Short mmCIF file of C-alpha atoms and ligand atoms in Angstrom, two decimals:
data_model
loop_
_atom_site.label_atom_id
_atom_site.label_comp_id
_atom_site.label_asym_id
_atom_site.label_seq_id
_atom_site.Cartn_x
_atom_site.Cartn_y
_atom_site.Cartn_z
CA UNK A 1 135.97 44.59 -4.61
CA UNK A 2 135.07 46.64 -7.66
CA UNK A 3 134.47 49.64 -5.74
CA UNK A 4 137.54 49.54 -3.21
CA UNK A 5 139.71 49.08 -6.38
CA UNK A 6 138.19 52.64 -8.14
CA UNK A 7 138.79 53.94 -5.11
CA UNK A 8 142.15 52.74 -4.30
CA UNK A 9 143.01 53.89 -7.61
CA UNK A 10 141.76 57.52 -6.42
CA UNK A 11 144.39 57.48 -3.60
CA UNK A 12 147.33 56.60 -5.63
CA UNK A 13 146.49 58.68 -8.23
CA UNK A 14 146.15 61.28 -5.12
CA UNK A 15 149.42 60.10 -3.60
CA UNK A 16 151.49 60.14 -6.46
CA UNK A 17 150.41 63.34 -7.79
CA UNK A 18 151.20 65.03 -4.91
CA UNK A 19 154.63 62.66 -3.91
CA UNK A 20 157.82 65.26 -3.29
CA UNK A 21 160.60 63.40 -3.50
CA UNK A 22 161.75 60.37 -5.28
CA UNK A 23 162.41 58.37 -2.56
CA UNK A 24 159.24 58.31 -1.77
CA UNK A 25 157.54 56.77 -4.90
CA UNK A 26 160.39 53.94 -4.77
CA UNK A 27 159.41 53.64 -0.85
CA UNK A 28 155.49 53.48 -2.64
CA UNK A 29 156.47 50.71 -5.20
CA UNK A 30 157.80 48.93 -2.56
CA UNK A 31 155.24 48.84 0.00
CA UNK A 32 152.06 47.99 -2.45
CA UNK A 33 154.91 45.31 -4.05
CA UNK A 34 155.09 43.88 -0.94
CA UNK A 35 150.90 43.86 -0.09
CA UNK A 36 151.15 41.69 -3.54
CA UNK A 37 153.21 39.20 -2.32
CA UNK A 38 156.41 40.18 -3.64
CA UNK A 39 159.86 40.66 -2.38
CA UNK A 40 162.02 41.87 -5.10
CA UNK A 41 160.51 45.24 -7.60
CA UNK A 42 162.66 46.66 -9.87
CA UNK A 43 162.23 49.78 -12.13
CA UNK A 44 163.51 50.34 -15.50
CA UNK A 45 163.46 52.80 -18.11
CA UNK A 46 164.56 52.73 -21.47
CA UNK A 47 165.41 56.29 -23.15
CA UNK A 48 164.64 56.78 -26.78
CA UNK A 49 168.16 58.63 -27.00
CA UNK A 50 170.98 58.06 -28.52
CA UNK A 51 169.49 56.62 -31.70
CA UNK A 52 173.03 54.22 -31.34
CA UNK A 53 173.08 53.02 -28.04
CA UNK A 54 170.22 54.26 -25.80
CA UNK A 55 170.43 54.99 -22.18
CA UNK A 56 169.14 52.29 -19.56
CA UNK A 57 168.47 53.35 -16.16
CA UNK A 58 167.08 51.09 -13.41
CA UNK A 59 166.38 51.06 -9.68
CA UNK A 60 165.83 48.10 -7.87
CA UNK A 61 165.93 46.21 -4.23
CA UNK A 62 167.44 42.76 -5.93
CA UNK A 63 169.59 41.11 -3.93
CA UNK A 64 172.99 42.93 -5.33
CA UNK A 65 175.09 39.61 -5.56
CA UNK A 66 172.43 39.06 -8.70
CA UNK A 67 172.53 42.53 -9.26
CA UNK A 68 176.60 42.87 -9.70
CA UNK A 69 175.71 39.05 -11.49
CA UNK A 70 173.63 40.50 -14.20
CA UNK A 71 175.47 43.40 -15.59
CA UNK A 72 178.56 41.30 -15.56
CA UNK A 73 176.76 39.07 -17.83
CA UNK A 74 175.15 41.47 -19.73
CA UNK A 75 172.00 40.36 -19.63
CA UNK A 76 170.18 43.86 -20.42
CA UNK A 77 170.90 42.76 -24.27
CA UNK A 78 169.02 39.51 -24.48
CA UNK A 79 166.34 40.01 -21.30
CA UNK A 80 162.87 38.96 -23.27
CA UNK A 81 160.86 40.99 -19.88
CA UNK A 82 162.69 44.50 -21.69
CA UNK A 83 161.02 43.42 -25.22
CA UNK A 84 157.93 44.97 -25.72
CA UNK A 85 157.22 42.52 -28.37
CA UNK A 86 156.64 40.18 -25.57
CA UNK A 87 154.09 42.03 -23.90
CA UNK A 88 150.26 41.92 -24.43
CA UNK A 89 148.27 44.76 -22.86
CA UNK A 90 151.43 46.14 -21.40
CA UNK A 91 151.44 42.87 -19.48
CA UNK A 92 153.67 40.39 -19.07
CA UNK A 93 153.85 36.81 -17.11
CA UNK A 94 157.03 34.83 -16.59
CA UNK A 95 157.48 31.35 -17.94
CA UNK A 96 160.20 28.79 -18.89
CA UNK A 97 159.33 29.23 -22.65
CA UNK A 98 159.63 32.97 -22.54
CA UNK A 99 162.92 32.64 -21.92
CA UNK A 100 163.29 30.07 -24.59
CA UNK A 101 166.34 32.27 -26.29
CA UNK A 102 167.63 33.67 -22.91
CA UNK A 103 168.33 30.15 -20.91
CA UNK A 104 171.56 31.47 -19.18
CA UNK A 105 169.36 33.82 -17.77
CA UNK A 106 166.50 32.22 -16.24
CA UNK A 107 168.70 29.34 -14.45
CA UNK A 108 171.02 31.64 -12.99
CA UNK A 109 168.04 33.68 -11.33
CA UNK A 110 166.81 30.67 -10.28
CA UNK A 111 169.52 30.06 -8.82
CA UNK A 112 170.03 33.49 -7.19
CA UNK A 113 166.10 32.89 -5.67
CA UNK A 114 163.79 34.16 -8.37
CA UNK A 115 161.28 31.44 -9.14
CA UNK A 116 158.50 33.26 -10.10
CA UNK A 117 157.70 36.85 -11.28
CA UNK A 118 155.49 39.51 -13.42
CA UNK A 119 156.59 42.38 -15.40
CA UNK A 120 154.26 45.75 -16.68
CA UNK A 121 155.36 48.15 -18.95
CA UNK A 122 154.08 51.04 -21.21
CA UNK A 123 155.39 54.45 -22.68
CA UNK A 124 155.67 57.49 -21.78
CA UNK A 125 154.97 61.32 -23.77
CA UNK A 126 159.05 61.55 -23.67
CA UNK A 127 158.88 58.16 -25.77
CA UNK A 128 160.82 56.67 -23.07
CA UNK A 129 159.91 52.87 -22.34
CA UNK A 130 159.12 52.26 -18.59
CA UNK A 131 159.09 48.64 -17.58
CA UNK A 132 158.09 47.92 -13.41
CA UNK A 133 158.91 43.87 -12.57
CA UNK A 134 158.26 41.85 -9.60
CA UNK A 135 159.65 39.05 -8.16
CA UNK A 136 158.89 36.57 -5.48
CA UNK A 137 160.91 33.66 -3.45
CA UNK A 138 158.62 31.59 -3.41
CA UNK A 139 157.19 28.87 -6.07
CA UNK A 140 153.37 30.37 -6.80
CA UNK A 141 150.50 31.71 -8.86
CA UNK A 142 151.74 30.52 -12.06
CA UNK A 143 148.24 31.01 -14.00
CA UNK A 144 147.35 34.30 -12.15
CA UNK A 145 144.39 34.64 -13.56
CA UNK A 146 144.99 37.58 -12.24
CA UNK A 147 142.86 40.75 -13.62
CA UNK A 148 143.25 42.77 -10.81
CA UNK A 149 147.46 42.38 -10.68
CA UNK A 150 147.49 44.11 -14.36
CA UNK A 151 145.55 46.54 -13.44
CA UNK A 152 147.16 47.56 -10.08
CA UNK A 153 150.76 46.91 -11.99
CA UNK A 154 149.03 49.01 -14.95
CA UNK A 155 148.61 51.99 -12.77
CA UNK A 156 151.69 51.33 -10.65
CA UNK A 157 154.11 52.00 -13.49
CA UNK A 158 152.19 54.93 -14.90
CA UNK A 159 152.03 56.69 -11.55
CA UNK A 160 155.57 56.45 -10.72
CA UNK A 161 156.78 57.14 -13.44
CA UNK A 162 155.05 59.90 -13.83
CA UNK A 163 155.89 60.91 -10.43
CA UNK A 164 159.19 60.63 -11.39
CA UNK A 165 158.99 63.46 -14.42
CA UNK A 166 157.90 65.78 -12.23
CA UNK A 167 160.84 65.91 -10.21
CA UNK A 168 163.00 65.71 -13.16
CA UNK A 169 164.38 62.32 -11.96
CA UNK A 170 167.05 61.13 -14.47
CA UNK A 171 166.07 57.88 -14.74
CA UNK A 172 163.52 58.86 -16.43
CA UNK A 173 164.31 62.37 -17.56
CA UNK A 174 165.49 62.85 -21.25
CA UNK A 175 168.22 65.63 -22.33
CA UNK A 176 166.94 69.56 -21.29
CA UNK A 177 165.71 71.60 -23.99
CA UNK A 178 164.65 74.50 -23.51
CA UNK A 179 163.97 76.38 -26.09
CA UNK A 180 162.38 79.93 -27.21
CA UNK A 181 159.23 79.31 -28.97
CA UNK A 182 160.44 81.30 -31.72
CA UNK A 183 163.55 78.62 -31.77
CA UNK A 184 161.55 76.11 -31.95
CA UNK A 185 159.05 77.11 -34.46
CA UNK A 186 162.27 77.14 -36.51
CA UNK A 187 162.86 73.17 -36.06
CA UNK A 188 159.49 72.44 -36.63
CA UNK A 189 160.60 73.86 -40.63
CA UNK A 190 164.01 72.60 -40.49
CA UNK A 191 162.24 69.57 -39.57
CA UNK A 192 160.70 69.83 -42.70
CA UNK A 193 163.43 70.43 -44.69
CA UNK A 194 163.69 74.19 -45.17
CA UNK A 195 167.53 75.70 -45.60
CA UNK A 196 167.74 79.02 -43.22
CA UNK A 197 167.41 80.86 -46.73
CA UNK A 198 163.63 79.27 -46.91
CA UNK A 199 163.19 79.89 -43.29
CA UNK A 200 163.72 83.64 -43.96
CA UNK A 201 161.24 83.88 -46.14
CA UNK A 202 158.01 82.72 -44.50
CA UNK A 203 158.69 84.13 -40.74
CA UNK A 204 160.31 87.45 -42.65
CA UNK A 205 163.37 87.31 -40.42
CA UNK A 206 167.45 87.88 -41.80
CA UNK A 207 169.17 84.81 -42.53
CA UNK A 208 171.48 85.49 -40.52
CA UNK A 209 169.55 85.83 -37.20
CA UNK A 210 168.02 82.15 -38.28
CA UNK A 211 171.68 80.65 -38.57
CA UNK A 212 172.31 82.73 -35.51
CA UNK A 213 169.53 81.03 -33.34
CA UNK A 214 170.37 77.29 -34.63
CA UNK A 215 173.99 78.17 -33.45
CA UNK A 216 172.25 79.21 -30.42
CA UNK A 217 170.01 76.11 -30.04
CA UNK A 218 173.15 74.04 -30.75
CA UNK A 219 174.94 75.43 -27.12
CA UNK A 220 172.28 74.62 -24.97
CA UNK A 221 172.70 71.05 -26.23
CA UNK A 222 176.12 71.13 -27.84
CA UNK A 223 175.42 69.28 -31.24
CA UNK A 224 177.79 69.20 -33.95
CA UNK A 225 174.86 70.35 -36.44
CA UNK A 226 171.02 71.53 -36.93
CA UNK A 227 170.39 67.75 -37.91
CA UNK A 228 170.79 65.87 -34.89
CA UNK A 229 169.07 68.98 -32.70
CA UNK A 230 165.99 68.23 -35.04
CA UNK A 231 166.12 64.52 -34.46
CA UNK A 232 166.78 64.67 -30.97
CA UNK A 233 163.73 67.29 -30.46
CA UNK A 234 161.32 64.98 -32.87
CA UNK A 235 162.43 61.38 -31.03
CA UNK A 236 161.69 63.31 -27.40
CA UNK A 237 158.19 64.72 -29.06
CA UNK A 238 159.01 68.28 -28.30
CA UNK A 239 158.02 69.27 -31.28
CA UNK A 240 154.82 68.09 -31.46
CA UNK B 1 132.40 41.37 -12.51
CA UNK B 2 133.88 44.22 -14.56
CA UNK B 3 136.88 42.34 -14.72
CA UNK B 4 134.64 39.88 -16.60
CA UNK B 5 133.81 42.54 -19.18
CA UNK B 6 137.65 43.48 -19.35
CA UNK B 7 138.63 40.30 -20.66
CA UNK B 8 135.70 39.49 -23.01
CA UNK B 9 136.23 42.94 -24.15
CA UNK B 10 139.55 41.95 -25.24
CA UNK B 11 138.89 38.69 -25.90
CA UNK B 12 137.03 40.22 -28.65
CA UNK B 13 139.57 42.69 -30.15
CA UNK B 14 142.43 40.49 -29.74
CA UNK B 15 140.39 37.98 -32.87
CA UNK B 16 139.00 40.54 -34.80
CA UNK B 17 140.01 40.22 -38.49
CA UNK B 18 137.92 43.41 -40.07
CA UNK B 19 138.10 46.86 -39.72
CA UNK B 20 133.97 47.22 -39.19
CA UNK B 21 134.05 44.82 -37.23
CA UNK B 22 135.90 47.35 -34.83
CA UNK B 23 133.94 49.86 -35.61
CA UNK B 24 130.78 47.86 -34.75
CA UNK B 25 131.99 46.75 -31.47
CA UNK B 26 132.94 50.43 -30.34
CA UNK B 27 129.59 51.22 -31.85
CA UNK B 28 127.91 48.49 -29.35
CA UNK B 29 130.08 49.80 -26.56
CA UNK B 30 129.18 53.15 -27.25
CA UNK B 31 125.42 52.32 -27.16
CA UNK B 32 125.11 50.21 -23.87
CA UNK B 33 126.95 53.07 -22.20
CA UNK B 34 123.87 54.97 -23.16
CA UNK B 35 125.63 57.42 -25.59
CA UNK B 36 123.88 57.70 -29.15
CA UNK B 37 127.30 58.59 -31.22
CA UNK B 38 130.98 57.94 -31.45
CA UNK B 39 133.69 59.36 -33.23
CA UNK B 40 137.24 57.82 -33.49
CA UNK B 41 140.22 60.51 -34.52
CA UNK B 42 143.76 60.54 -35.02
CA UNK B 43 145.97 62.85 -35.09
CA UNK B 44 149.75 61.67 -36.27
CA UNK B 45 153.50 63.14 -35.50
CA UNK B 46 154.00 64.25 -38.50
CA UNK B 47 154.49 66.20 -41.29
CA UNK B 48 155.11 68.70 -37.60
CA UNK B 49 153.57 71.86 -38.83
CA UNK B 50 150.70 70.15 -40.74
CA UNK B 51 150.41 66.96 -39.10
CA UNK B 52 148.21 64.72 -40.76
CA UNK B 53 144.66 63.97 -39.00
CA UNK B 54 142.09 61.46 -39.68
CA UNK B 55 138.98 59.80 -38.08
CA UNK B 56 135.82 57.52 -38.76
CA UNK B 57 132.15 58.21 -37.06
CA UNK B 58 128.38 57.49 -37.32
CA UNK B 59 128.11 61.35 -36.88
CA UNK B 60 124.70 62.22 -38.64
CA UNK B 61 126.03 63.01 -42.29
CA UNK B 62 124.86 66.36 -42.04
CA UNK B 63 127.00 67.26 -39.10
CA UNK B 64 130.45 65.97 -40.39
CA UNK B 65 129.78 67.90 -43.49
CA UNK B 66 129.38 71.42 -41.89
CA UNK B 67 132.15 70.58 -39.25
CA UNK B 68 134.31 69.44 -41.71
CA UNK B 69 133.70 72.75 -44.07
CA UNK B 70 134.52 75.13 -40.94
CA UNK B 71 137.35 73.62 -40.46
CA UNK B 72 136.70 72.84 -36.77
CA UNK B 73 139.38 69.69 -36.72
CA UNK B 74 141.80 73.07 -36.57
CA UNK B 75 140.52 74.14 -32.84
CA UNK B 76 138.60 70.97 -31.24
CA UNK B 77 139.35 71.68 -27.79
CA UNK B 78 138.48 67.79 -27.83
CA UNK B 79 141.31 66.94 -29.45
CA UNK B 80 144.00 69.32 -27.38
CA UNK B 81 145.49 66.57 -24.87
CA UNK B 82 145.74 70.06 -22.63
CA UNK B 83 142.57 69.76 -21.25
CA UNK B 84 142.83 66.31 -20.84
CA UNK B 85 143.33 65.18 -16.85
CA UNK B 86 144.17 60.98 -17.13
CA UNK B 87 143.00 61.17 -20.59
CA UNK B 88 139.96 61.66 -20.05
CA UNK B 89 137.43 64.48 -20.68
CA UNK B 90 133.88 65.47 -19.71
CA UNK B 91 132.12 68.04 -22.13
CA UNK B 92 131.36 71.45 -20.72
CA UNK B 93 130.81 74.69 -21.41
CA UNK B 94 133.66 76.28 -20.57
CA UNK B 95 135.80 74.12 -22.66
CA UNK B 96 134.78 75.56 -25.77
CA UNK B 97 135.01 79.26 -24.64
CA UNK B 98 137.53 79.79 -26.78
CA UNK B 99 135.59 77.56 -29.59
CA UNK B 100 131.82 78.76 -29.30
CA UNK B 101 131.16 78.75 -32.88
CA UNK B 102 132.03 74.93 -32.87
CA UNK B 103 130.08 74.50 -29.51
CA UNK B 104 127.01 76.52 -31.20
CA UNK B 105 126.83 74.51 -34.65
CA UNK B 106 127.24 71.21 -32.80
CA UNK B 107 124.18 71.79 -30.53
CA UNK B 108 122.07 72.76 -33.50
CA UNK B 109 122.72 69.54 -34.77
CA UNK B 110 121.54 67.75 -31.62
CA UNK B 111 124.85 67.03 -29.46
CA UNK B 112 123.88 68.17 -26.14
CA UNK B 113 126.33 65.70 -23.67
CA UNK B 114 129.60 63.91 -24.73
CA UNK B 115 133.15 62.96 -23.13
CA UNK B 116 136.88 62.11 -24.85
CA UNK B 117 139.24 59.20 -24.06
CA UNK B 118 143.09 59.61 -25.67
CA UNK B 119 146.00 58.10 -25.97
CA UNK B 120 149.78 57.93 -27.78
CA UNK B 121 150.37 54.59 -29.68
CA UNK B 122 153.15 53.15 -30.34
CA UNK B 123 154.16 55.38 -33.27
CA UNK B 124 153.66 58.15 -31.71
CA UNK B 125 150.07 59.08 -32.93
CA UNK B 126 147.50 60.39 -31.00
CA UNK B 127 144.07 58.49 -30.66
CA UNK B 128 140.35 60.12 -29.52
CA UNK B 129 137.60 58.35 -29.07
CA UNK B 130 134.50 60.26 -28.76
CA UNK B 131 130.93 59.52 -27.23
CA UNK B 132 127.87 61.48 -27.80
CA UNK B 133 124.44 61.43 -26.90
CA UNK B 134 121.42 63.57 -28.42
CA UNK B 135 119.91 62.94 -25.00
CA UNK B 136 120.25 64.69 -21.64
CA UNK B 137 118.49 63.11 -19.39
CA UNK B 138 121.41 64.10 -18.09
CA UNK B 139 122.48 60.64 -16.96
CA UNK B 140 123.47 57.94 -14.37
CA UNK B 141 127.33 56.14 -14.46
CA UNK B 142 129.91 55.94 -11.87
CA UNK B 143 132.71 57.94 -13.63
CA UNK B 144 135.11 55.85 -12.74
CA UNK B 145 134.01 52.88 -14.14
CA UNK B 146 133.54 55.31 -17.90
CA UNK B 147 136.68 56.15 -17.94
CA UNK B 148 137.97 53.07 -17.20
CA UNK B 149 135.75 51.31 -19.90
CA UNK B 150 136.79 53.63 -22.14
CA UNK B 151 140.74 53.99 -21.67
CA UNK B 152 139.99 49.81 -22.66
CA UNK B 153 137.94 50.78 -25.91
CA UNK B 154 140.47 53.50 -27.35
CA UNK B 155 143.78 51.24 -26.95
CA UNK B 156 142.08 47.55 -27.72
CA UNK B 157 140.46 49.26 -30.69
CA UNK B 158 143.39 51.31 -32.69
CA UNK B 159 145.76 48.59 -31.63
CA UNK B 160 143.12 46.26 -33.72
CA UNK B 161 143.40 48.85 -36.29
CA UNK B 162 146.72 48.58 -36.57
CA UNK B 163 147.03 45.05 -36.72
CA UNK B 164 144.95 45.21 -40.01
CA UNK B 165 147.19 48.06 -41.44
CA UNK B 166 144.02 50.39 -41.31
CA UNK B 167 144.97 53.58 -42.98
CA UNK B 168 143.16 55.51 -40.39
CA UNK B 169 146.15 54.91 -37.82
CA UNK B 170 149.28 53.65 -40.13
CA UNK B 171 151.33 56.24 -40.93
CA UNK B 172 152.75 57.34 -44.31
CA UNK B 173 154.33 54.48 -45.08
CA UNK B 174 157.61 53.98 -44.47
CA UNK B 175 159.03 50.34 -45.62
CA UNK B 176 163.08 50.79 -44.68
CA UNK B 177 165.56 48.22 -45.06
CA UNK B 178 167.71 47.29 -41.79
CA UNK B 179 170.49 49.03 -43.89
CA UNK B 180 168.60 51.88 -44.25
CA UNK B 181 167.42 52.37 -40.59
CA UNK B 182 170.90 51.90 -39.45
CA UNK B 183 172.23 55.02 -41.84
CA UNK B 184 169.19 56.86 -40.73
CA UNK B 185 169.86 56.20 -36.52
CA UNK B 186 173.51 57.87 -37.70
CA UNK B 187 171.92 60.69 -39.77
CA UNK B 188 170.09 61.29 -36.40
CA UNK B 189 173.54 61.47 -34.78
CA UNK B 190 174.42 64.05 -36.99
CA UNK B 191 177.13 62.43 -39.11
CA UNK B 192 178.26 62.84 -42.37
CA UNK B 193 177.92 60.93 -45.03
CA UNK B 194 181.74 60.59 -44.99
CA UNK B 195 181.41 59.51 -41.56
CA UNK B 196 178.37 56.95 -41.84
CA UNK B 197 180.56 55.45 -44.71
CA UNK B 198 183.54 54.73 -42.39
CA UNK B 199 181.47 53.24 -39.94
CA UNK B 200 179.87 51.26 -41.88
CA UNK B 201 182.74 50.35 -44.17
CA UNK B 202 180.35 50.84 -47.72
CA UNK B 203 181.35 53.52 -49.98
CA UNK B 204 179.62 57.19 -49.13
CA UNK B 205 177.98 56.80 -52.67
CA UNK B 206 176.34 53.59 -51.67
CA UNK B 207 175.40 55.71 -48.51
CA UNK B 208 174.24 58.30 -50.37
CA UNK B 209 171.95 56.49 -52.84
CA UNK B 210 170.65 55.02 -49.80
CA UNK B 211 169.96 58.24 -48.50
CA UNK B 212 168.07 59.55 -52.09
CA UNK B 213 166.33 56.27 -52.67
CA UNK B 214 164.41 57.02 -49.32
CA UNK B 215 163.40 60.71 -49.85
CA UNK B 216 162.47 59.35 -53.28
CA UNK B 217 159.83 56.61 -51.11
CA UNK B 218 158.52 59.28 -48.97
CA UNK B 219 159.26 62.53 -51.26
CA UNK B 220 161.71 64.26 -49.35
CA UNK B 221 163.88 67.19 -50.15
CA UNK B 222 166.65 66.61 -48.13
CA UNK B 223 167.96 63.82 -45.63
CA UNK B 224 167.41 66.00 -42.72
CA UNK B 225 163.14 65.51 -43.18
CA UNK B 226 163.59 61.65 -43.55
CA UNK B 227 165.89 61.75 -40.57
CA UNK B 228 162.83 63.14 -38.42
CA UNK B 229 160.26 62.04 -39.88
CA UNK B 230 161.82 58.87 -38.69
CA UNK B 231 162.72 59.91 -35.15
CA UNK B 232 159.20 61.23 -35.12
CA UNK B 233 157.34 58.15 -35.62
CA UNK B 234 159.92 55.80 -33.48
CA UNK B 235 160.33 53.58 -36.80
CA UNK B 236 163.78 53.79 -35.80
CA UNK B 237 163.37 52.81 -31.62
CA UNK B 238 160.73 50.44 -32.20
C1 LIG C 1 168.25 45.44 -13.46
C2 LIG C 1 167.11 44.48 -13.68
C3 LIG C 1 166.66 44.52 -15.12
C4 LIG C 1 165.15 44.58 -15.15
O1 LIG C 1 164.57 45.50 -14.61
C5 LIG C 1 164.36 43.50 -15.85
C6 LIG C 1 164.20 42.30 -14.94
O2 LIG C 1 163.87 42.45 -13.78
N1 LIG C 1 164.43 41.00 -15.45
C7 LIG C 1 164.29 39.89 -14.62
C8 LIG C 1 164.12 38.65 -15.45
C9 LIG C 1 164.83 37.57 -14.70
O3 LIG C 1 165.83 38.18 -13.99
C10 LIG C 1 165.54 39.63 -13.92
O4 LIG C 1 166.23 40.46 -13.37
C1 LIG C 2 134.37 63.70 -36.36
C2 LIG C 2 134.47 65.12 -35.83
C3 LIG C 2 135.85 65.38 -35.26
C4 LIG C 2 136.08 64.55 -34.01
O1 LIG C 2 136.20 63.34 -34.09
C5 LIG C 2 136.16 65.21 -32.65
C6 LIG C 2 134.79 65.29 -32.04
O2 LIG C 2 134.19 64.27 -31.74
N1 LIG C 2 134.19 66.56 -31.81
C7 LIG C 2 132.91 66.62 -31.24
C8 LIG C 2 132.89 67.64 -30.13
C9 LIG C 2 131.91 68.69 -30.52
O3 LIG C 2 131.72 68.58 -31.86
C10 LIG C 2 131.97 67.17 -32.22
O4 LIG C 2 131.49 66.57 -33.16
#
């Protein structure tokens, strides 16, 4: 069972790499959540932008009474499974005393059927925070022991997410930029702190042709001002 | 049975109170994976056309020296997540086509075989880990099960590292008030300092000597570099 693992890795890795369409890495989460055991999954993302109020995107197959139950609750704010200060080798196993701060939470998804559940997360090269949960019906595996479960949820919410990327899926796509390299090579300096005047100078290039192209990087993103296109560009890692 | 080594591996880590201590382990790890060397490099977000690099290694003295003199940190294929596939990376010849000088010097010091794990932490730094071997012999491991080991020994370590504030993988320290992040997650908005002092309801000179009293901490010219910088590292997503 050490070998059919490696290789089982080797076909998802083979699968999802070569996956077409969204649907079909949601269809892929499914089935393999349900070989575990499992009848609820749900996918989430957290986006590193805005800096105020980030974007949360999610898909799931929770029963939508709990669903409609949670956001009307607002219980994105206070859920301990979307802390990553929780988490211990992007792993995560839930108990009553994780939810120690959150008890309006746990009771009422016990009450809408989830007993037991297991939640994996980790981050991805747009900085956004992917977390993958499941959840089953059924009173069970409290210790799990279980190596093998963090591992396949390990690779489960790397794959699809990565999946995901490449077909610029929202939910886990941050705001478009591109960019000229030549535009961008002037963020890296403005970045850094350098007025268009000291931009001029090292890439010998007018002034006005530099406050030309950070008017011109502003459109494709409509910012009021070079400061939050640098930001924006250095939170997403696209400039470096 | 591996999944026996995966939890005394970070069984391990998880109570480790010294940096050599690290060190020793991947040194041990390195070893009984039949690889001679191992070298342990980060590269951080920032400053982002300079970005700050540093690493630790039982590299023969020798070695480090001359590599270090050439300047070969600047075009390590090794350390260009490019050529990376599952971050992970087998040595070969054709990787260093474009770096032969590097590939020449570093077989005259005796590194005939090696292979690279990476990965991004938390604040956005980039981690290597390295093994060597003077030995070839070319050798006997399911792949798989390397790569797998490893992926374990690059996170488990600099996560270690970090716990202990090593300077290796903390970057330039930046030590911000709540108040300060929160005029700083604005900044990144692109408001004014008019603007952040509305919100806020403080006074825009209280906002601004917030905003000098950090570029004076980090030596800054402006608030737009503190603003990234910031951004850059996640200090303000966290
Ligand atoms: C939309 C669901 C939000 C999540 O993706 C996190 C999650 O599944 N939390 C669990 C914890 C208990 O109830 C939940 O929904
Ligand atoms: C300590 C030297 C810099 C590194 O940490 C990267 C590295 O291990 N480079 C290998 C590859 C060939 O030359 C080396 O020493």
């Amino acid at each position: 069972q050490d070998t059919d693992f490696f290789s089982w890795r080797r076909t998802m890795l083979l699968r999802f790499q070569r996956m077409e369409t969204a649907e079909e890495v949601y269809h892929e989460i499914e089935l393999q959540a349900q070989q575990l055991e499992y009848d609820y999954y749900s996918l989430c993302v957290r986006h590193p932008v805005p800096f105020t109020r980030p974007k949360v995107a999610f898909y799931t197959n929770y029963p939508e009474a709990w669903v409609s139950y949670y956001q009307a609750k607002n219980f994105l704010a206070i859920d301990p499974v979307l802390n990553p200060e929780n988490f211990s080798q992007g792993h995560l196993m839930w108990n009553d005393d994780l939810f120690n701060e959150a008890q309006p939470l746990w009771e009422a998804a016990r009450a809408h059927g989830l007993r037991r559940g297991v939640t994996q997360y980790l981050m991805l090269p747009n900085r956004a925070l992917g977390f993958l949960s499941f959840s089953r019906c059924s009173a069970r595996e409290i210790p799990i022991l279980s190596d093998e479960l963090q591992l396949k949820m390990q690779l489960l919410v790397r794959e699809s997410l990565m999946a995901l990327m490449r077909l610029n899926d929202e939910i886990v796509m941050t705001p478009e930029m591109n960019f000229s390299k030549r535009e961008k090579e002037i963020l890296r300096w403005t970045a850094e702190g350098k007025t268009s005047a000291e931009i001029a100078m090292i890439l010998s290039i007018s002034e006005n042709t530099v406050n030309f192209h950070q008017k011109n990087m502003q459109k494709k993103i409509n910012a009021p001002n070079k400061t939050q296109v640098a930001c924006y560009a250095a939170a997403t890692g696209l400039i470096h």
